[PDB]
C-alpha cells in the first residue's frame, strides 16, 4: 500500500495547498510519496518536491505533464489541490483515464461544486436554500435583478480570490473586470449583512456522515483572502454556539446537498446564518487540510482523529473504485 | 497540425472510428490519427490508420498515457463517444497537457453526461424535461408517477443498460441492469407516442443553431441496435413553424446555461404538442450519415467549414 500525494497546483491557492500537504504527510498512516505541481504547470518529484514543500512555494517545475511516474506503484492518489485544475474535476478526470483510485469527489461532483452558479442551480432545484444570485458571462452585459450590496465572484474560485463586495451599481463593472481575470463566468449574489458563517464536515461516499458544526469569525468585513490564511486572523468556534435544532438543520442540509450532488470521500459544506435564516454558500471538495484546519478539527471534535481521518479517506477511495 | 483521437473503450467504439473516417476526409488541416483500442491501450502512427481501415481496434500497443509527442500538435480533436469520451475525463487530461481541444470542457462534458444533474440544471432554468427521479444503489426507489418508465444508467451512451419498463414490478430488474453500468440511475416518465427531434449547436457558449432534424425508426425505442437501414433521418423535420422555433430557442438556452463549448447535438422529445429536452450530446457522431454534420450541411455550413470552425473555436477559447 502506497499513496501518491499531489500538492501545489497552478491555482491561486498554490501556497495553501502546500501547507495542507505538510500536515497530511506528517500524519498519514500509509507509505506516501509526494508530487508537487509547480506554479508553471510542471511537476517536481522526489527530493525536489520535498524541497519545495519546505520552501512553501514552487514557481518553476522540472517535468511537463504527464510526469514520468510509475502509476502502478501507487494504490491511491490523494489530490490535495485547491482551486482550478485541482478540485474542479480536471485532475480527477486524468485519474479516471489512468484507472487509479483517488481520494475525494469524482469528475462531475468536483466540477459542479467548484461552479458557484451551477451548484446553486442544482441546490435550488432540490429545495436547498441559497443566496439570490445571477450569472454573468464575459462580454454579455450584466442584468442584476436586485439592488446592492453585491458580492461579485468568479464562478470557479477559492480562498476568496477575485471576490468583491460592491455597494453601488457604479462599482459593479470594476468588480466584473476583476472577476473575469479568473473565469469566463461570474456570479452576482445578494449580500448578507450581518452574516454568521457556519461550516460542517461530511465523510463518506454519497451517503456521508456529518461532523459537529463549527463557525468562523474574523475582524474584516468578510472572510477575504488576507484574512483566511494569515494565522490567527481567523477564529474557529468548535462546536459553534447554535440551538440544537439549528445544528441539526445544518447537518441535515449538508448531507442532502452531499447526496444530491453525488459527492465522494469528503466535503466541507459552508453556510450563511442571517439571524435564523440558513443559506448554503458552497461545497469545498478539497478543504484545507492542515492539522488545525476547520475540516480536520471538526471531525477531531467528532471522534475521528487526524490520522484516522486520513486512513478512512484512502479506504473510501479504494472502496469506490474496486467495488463501485 | 491536429491530433485526432478516436475509438475508445465504450460500446460506440466502431462508430468513433467511422466518425474519424469522415473527419480525416474533409478537415482542412494536417491531421494525424491516434486510436484508443477497446482494451484502453493506444495505437499510434501507421498502426492507428491500420485500425481505421480495419473498422475496429480490439487491442492496443501503448498503455495510457501514450508516449505521444503532444508538442507537435496545436489542437486535439477528441472523437470519443460515451464513457471515457464525453464525460470530462479525456478533457481533464488535455487540460493538464495544456493543449487546445475541440468541444465542451470538463464541467460541461460531465454535466451533459449525467442524465440526473443535467435535468436538475435544465429544470431550474425553466427548460422543459420529462418527469424523472434519480435512484442510487442500495436505496429503494421512490417513483411518484405511473408506468411506462424509461430506466437508464445516469452516465450511459447508445442506450446501454436502458430498459423501457411497462410494469411497476419490472422496475426492480431494470434498476439492477442499469446499476451494473453506473452507481446512479434515472427513472423517467416514458412518453408514448413520441417523436424524436435533434438540433445542432455550434459556438462557444453563445452558439448558432442548425436546422431541426427528426429521427424515425422501427424499434420500441431508439436503441443501440437501431444498423444503417432501421433509422431514417428527416432533414429538416416536418414541424409546424412555432415548434421548430422553440426547439432552437431551448437548444441555445440550455447550451448557454451549461456553458457548452465547441458543439453539441441537442435531442428533444415531442409528445402531444409539448417539447422536452432529452439530452445534450457533446461529441455527436460525425459519420457522413450522422445527424450533426448533415444538419449544418442543410443550413449552409459545408462539412469542411464545419470542421474548420470547430478547430478555430477551440483555439479561440484557449
Ligand atoms: N452572498 C454573500 N453574503 C455575505 N457574504 C458573502 C456572500 N458571498 C460571499 N461572502 C463572503 O465572502 C467569502 C468568500 O465567499 P465564497 O463564496 O466562500 O468564496 P470562496 O469559495 O473563495 O471561499 C465568504 O466566506 C463570505 O464571508
Ligand atoms: N422519457 C422517454 N420517453 C420516450 N422515449 C425515451 C425516453 N427516454 C429515452 N427514450 C428512448 O430511448 C432512447 C435513448 O435514450 P437516451 O436518454 O438518449 O439514451 P442515450 O444517452 O443512450 O442516447 C431515445 O432515443 C428514446 O427513443
Ligand atoms: K467550491
Ligand atoms: Mg470555496
Ligand atoms: Mg468559502
Ligand atoms: Mg440519445
Write the DSSP string, A104-118. Answer: S--HHHHHHHH-HHH
Residue-by-residue DSSP string for A200-262: EEEESSSS-EEEEEEEEEESSSS--HHHHHSTTSEEEESS----HHHHHHHHHHHHHHHHHTT
What is the C-alpha separation between A117 and A120, in angstroms, rounded? 5
Sign for the pseudo-dihedral over CA of B246, B252, B258, B260: positive
What contacts A77, CB < 8 A, 6 or more positions away? Answer: A3, A4, A6, A95, A100, A101, A102, A103
Q: Within 13 Å, how many C-alpha atoms sit on residue B211's CB side?
A: 19
Domain match, B85 and B149 both: no
Sheet holding B231-234, edge to edge: B231-234, B208-217, B195-202, B263-271, B274-281
For residue A36, give the DSSP letter. Answer: E
**Minimal Cα–Cα distance from A93 to chain B, Å?**
4
Contacts 24+ apart (CB under 8 A), B225-229: B228/B289
For residue B161, the CA-to-ligand 6 centroid distance in Å is 13
Look-up: residue for cell 444503417?
Answer: B228
Chain A positions in Cβ-Cβ contact with residue B98 (cut-off 8 Å): 41, 65
Chain A positions in Cβ-Cβ contact with residue B96 (cut-off 8 Å): 65-66, 85, 90-91, 94
The Cα-based distances of A294 to A104, A156, A223, A240 in angstroms read 17, 21, 14, 12
What contacts A89, CB < 8 A, 6 or more positions away? Answer: A106, A107, A108, A109, A110, A111, A114, B88, B92, B106, B107, B110
Question: What does the H/E/C string look like for B64-85?
Answer: CCCCCCHHHCCEEEEECCCCCC
Chain mean position to CA B154: 14
What is the C-alpha separation between B266 and A94, in angstroms, rounded? 27
Ligand at minimal distance from the CA of A284 is 3
Burial class (CB in 10 A: 0-12, 13-18, 19+), B209: buried
| Residue A140: strand, helix, or coil | coil
Mutate to test the pocket of ligand 1, among A222, A227, A236, A278 (most ligand atoms within 8 A of CB): A222
Chain mean position to CA B239: 23
What contacts A184, CB < 8 A, 6 or more positions away? Answer: A137, A138, A155, B205, B259
Chain B contacts to A (CB-CB under 8 A):
40, 64-65, 84, 87-93, 95-98, 106-107, 110-111, 113-114, 117, 120-121, 123-125, 136-139, 183-184, 205-206, 256-259
Q: How wide is the angle at C-alpha A198 spanned by C-alphas A197 and A202, nearest 5°?
A: 145
| Residue A272: strand, helix, or coil | strand
Chain mean position to CA A55: 23
What is the C-alpha separation between B145 and B256, in angstroms, rounded? 30
The Cα-based distances of B266 to A21, B17, B257 in angstroms read 43, 22, 13
Answer yes or no: A159 catalytic. Answer: yes
What is the helix (H) or strand (E) element at residue B251, kind and residue range? helix B241-257
What is the C-alpha separation between A216 and A272, in angstroms, rounded? 11
Method of elucidation: X-ray
Q: Are B291 and B311 in contact (CB under 8 A)?
A: no
Terminal-residue alpha carbon distance, chain B: 16
Q: Are A110 and A92 in contact (CB under 8 A)?
A: yes
Domain match, B104 and B9 both: yes
What is the helix (H) or strand (E) element at residue B153, kind and residue range? strand B149-153
Look-up: residue for cell 454558500?
Answer: A281
For residue A191, give the DSSP letter. Answer: P
What contacts B312, CB < 8 A, 6 or more positions away? Answer: none
Q: Are A105 and A267 in contact (CB under 8 A)?
A: yes
Per DSSP, chain B holds a count of helices (H) and strands (E) of 9, 13
Main-chain dihedrals φ then ψ at residue B78, nearest 5 degrees? -80, 100
Query: What's the CATH code of the domain at B142?
Result: 3.30.1490.20
Answer yes or no: A229 catalytic. Answer: yes
Instruction: Locate A60 and state its grid cell.
Output: 518553476
Put simply, the answer to whether A108 touches B117 (Cβ < 8 Å) is yes
What is the C-alpha separation between A48 and B179, in angstroms, rounded? 44
Cis peptide before B277 (omega within 30 of 0): no
| Residue B105: strand, helix, or coil | coil
What contacts A188, CB < 8 A, 6 or more positions away? Answer: A133, A134, A136, A142, A144, A150, A151, A152, A172
What contacts A156, CB < 8 A, 6 or more positions away? Answer: A83, A84, A88, A114, A115, A116, A182, A183, A185
Q: What is the dihedral of CA B101, B103, B105, B109, to 10 degrees?
A: -140
Chain mean position to CA B208: 18
Q: How wide is the angle at C-alpha B53 spanned by C-alphas B51 and B56, nearest 5°?
A: 45
What contacts A271, CB < 8 A, 6 or more positions away? Answer: A197, A198, A199, A200, A250, A253, A254, A278, A279, A280, A281
What is the C-alpha separation between B38 and B60, in angstroms, rounded? 8
A 10 A CB-CB count for B262 gives 24
Domain match, B24 and B104 both: yes
Return the closest-CA partner of residue B132 out of A174, B123, B140: B123
Which domain does B175 fall in, by range? Answer: 132-189
Look-up: residue for cell 494525424?
Answer: B32
Put simply, the answer to whether A85 touches B107 (Cβ < 8 Å) is no
Q: Are B133 and B163 in contact (CB under 8 A)?
A: no
What contacts A216, CB < 8 A, 6 or more positions away? Answer: A197, A198, A199, A223, A234, A235, A236, A237, A294
Query: What's the CATH code of the domain at A20?
Result: 3.40.50.20
Q: Are A98 and B64 in contact (CB under 8 A)?
A: yes
A 10 A CB-CB count for A241 gives 10
For residue A157, give the DSSP letter. Answer: -
Beta bridge partners of A213: A200
Q: Are B51 and B44 in contact (CB under 8 A)?
A: no
Main-chain dihedrals φ then ψ at residue A100, nearest 5 degrees? -125, 130
Q: What is the dihedral of CA A122, A124, A127, A130, to 10 degrees?
A: 130
| Residue B242: strand, helix, or coil | helix
Domain match, B104 and B182 both: no
Amino acid at each position: 500500500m502506497r499513496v501518491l500525494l499531489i500538492a501545489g497546483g497552478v491555482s491561486p491557492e498554490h501556497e495553501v495547498s502546500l501547507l495542507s500537504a505538510e500536515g497530511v504527510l506528517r500524519h498519514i498512516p500509509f507509505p506516501t510519496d509526494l508530487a508537487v505541481i509547480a506554479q508553471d504547470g510542471r511537476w517536481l518529484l522526489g527530493e525536489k518536491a520535498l524541497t519545495a514543500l519546505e520552501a512553501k512555494a514552487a514557481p518553476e517545475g522540472e517535468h511537463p505533464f504527464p510526469p514520468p511516474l510509475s502509476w502502478e506503484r501507487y494504490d491511491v492518489v490523494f489530490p490535495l489541490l485547491h482551486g482550478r485544475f485541482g478540485e474542479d474535476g480536471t485532475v480527477q478526470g486524468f485519474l479516471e483515464l489512468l484507472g487509479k483510485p483517488y481520494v475525494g469527489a469524482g469528475v462531475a461532483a468536483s466540477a459542479l461544486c467548484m461552479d458557484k452558479d451551477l451548484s446553486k442551480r442544482v441546490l435550488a432545484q432540490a429545495g436547498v436554500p441559497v443566496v439570490p444570485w445571477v450569472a454573468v458571462r464575459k462580454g454579455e452585459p450584466p442584468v442584476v435583478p436586485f439592488d446592492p450590496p453585491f458580492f461579485v465572484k468568479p464562478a470557479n474560485t477559492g480562498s476568496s480570490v477575485g471576490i468583491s463586495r460592491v455597494e453601488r451599481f457604479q462599482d459593479l463593472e470594476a468588480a466584473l473586470a476583476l472577476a473575469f481575470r479568473y473565469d469566463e463566468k461570474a456570479v452576482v449574489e445578494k449580500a448578507l449583512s450581518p452574516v454568521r458563517e457556519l461550516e460542517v464536515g461530511v465523510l463518506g461516499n454519497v451517503f456521508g456522515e456529518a461532523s459537529p458544526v463549527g463557525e468562523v469569525r474574523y475582524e474584516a468585513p468578510f472572510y477575504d483572502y488576507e484574512t483566511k490564511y494569515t494565522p490567527g486572523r481567523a477564529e474557529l468556534l468548535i462546536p459553534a454556539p447554535l440551538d440544537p435544532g439549528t445544528q441539526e438543520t445544518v447537518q441535515e442540509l449538508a448531507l442532502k446537498a452531499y447526496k444530491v450532488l453525488g459527492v465522494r470521500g469528503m466535503a466541507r459544506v459552508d453556510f450563511f446564518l442571517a439571524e435564523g435564516e440558513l443559506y448554503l454558500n458552497e461545497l469545498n471538495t478539497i478543504p484545507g487540510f492542515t492539522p488545525t484546519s476547520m475540516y480536520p478539527r471538526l471531525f477531531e471534535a467528532g471522534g475521528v482523529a487526524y490520522p484516522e481521518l486520513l486512513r478512512r479517506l484512502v479506504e473510501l477511495a479504494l472502496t469506490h473504485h474496486h467495488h463501485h
